[PDB]
């Protein structure tokens, strides 16, 4: 299948940023390397922490890294026990004096990456995909989310052939530019096959 990627198309219209930083073309290639390099360690450390997303930025020979999360307790911990260890290694990789922020995302079902990580983590547990997809659906209109849909791709119940079998409930306007569409792609690490997890979440009109 062929579609426009919901997150990228909505950058100009109704998303804030995945990167607010400015840089000149001389150091842009080396700066963009360090932004993906820090996330490789950070996503590994915040795998069990259930990270939604993080915003990289570098205000004039510095670095912030605004970290959102579903679970603020495991990220912060007691005082700055787990905060100082994260901030230390970011300064070493980036090669600059690093700060750190905190942010609690209320209603984790509303985020795409949190629901995508929730569904794909159950695939290693070896539960039925029909129920795993439906558990995301069952709490849709209860708290926020005016529309939502989920799609799985290949290896459905350990089958020999690759099926899709997507599911939808509510209004998911995919090509309406003004509409707020939250989306993120995820993949499974299961030893019986690779299952892709796509989830489209619609919050509101404006």
């Amino acid at each position: 299948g062929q579609k426009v990627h919901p997150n990228g198309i909505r950058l100009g219209i109704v998303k804030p940023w995945n990167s607010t930083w400015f840089a000149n073309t001389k150091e842009f290639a080396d700066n963009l390397d360090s932004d993906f390099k820090v996330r490789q360690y950070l996503t590994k450390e915040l795998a069990k922490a259930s990270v939604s997303r993080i915003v990289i930025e570098r205000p004039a020979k510095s670095i912030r890294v605004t970290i959102h999360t579903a679970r603020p307790g495991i990220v912060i911990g007691k005082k700055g026990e787990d905060v100082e260890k994260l901030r230390k290694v970011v300064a070493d990789i980036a090669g600059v004096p690093a700060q750190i922020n905190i942010a609690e995302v209320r209603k984790p079902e509303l985020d795409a990456k949190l629901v995508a990580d929730s569904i794909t983590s159950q695939l290693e547990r070896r539960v039925m995909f029909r129920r795993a997809m439906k558990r995301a659906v069952q709490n849709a209109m209860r708290l926020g989310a005016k529309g939502i849909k989920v799609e799985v791709s290949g290896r459905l119940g350990g089958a020999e052939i690759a099926r899709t079998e997507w599911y939808r409930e509510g209004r998911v306007p995919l090509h309406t530019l003004r509409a707020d569409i939250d989306y993120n792609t995820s993949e499974a690490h299961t030893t019986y096959g690779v299952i892709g997890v796509k989830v489209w979440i619609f919050k509101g009109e404006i």
């Binding site: 990228g8 198309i9 842009f28 963009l32 993906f36």
Partner: peptide, 25 residues
Amino acid sequence: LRKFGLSRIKVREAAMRGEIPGLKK
């Protein structure tokens, strides 16, 4: 590309996930 320092396939995967500032369709 010398600007991004990445291959064409990784440009689309990155750009659609944001990350490059002021980049869009």
